[PDB]
Design a protein around this ligand. Structure first.
Ligand SMILES: Nc1ncnc2c1ncn2[C@@H]1O[C@H](COP(=O)(O)OP(=O)(O)OC[C@H]2O[C@@H](O)[C@H](O)[C@@H]2O)[C@@H](O)[C@H]1O
Length: 166
């Protein structure tokens, strides 16, 4: 009930400010799926994500980082670090779900008051950005969407999400 589902591609431009949340590996590889689509469009954000992975590696698990898209001041990117490696070496389902919860809790705390790269690029107060995501964990990471959906619903009354379905 804190989730609104919309049909369509999350990368089609929107008039309002938003944070695009997606699930990431800690290996500096936006290599497939939605992450690769972000790498094509937002190469400076990919650079930041790679830099954070190179510095902290899997110590990032259960954390998130907020990045400018740089190309559109109405679009930030929120990377949830939920697996050490991408592709077929991704972590087990319970690991990914636990880290998804922990990473979203850090996003929740940050909005209430992760944001190193926002300095000098964030146009609005962070609370003014809508929270949007594809069906994270359900593609390359192989987690049935209903299990991630239950994680999102743990934040009812704290955060609301718009989830895109192709
Ligand atoms: N523009 C898009 N718009 C809306 N939905 C999309 C889009 N692109 C993909 N999707 C949907 O989002 C689902 C999740 O996409 P994945 O990229 O497979 O994400 P995930 O399962 O969370 O795996 C994360 C892993 O893959 C890479 O994205 C990332 O580098 C990480 O290692 C996909 O199954 C797909 O159905």
């Amino acid at each position: 009930s804190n989730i609104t589902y919309v049909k369509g591609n999350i990368l089609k431009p929107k008039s309002y400010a938003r944070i695009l949340i997606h699930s990431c590996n800690c290996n500096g590889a936006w290599g497939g799926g939605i992450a690769y689509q972000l790498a094509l469009r937002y190469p400076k954000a990919e650079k930041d994500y790679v830099e954070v992975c190179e510095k902290y590696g899997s110590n990032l698990l259960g954390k998130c980082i907020l990045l400018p898209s740089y190309e559109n001041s109405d679009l930030l990117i929120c990377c949830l670090f939920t697996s050490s490696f991408g592709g077929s070496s991704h972590g087990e389902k319970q690991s990914i779900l636990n880290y998804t919860k922990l990473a979203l809790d850090k996003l929740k705390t940050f909005r209430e008051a992760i944001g190193d790269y926002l300095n000098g690029h964030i146009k609005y107060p962070i609370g003014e950005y809508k929270l949007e995501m594809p069906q994270i964990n359900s593609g390359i990471f192989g987690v049935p969407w209903k299990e991630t959906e239950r994680v999102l619903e743990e934040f009812s009354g704290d955060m609301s999400f718009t989830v895109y379905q192709l």
